[PDB]
Amino acid sequence: TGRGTSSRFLTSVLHNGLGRYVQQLQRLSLSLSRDAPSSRGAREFVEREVTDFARRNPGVVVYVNPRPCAMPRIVAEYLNGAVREENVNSKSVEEIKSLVQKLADQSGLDVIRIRKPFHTDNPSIQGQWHPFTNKRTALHGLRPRELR
């Protein structure tokens, strides 16, 4: 599936940790049904856990839309422009609470194979190896067998 799928390298949206850490998640949309067995758990999330999540994350704008609905859905939008949608159909408060926190911590970067666990922009301090390093010079720079 690696050859059947795309890949990328480890990265951050705007050098997130260098100067100041900024939370990537910027919007949550939750659509609910006032009376629907599938949306019962999501309803309890609004009653109990939505306000506390909203306060902990003041940079995330949260929209709650009770409406005649068949499946409750969560839409998460990020600064880099990624959009993620989740079925919340017939999930407990514990599952929806767990899912919502995972979305906040994530970045918009696509969840695909990451080629290397590490990444540097300044790999070398002392100079990158080239074939001449560890080769001693010769007087007058005479190549082998040169008469002069």
Partner 1 sequence: ISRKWEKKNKIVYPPQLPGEPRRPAEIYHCRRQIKYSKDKMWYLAKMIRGMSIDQALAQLEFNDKKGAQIIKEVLLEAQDMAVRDHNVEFRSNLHIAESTSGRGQCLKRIRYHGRGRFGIMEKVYCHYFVKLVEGPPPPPEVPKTAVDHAKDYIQQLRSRTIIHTL
Partner RNA sequence: CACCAACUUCCUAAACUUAAAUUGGGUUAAUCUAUAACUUUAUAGAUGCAACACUGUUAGUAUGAGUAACAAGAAUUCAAU
Q: Which residues of the chain form contacts with partner 1 (CB under 8 A)?
A: 118, 120, 123
The answer to whether residues 29 and 61 touch, using CB atoms and an 8 Å cutoff, is no
Instruction: Measure Cα distances from 127 to 75, 133, 134 in Å.
Output: 48, 9, 12
Q: Spell out the SS3 assignment of 77-104.
A: EECCCCEEEEECCCCCHHHHHHHHHHHH
Q: Which is nearer to RNA, 51 or 98 (CB)?
A: 98
> What is the C-alpha to C-alpha distance for residues 107 and 90, in angstroms, rounded to an integer?
26
| Residue 90 touches which member of RNA, partner 1, none, C-beta under 5-8 Å by kind | RNA
Q: Is 36 in the site for RNA (CB under 7 A)?
A: yes
Which of RNA, partner 1, none does residue 69 bind (CB under 5 to 8 Å by kind)? RNA
Q: How far is the CB of 87 from RNA (least distance, A)?
A: 9
User: By CB under 7 A, what part of segment 62-121 binds RNA?
Assistant: 68-71, 73, 89-90
* Total number of residues that touch RNA (CB under 7 A): 13
Residue 71's binding partner out of RNA, partner 1, none, with CB under 5 to 8 Å set by partner kind: RNA
According to DSSP, residue 1 is labeled -
* 4 counts as binding RNA under rule CB under 7 A: no
Tell me if 33 contacts RNA by CB under 7 A. Answer: yes
Three-class SS state of 59: coil
> Which residues, 6 or more positions from 115, have their beta carbon under 8 angstroms from its beta carbon?
7, 8, 9, 10
Contact residues: RNA, CB under 7 A? 33-38, 68-71, 73, 89-90
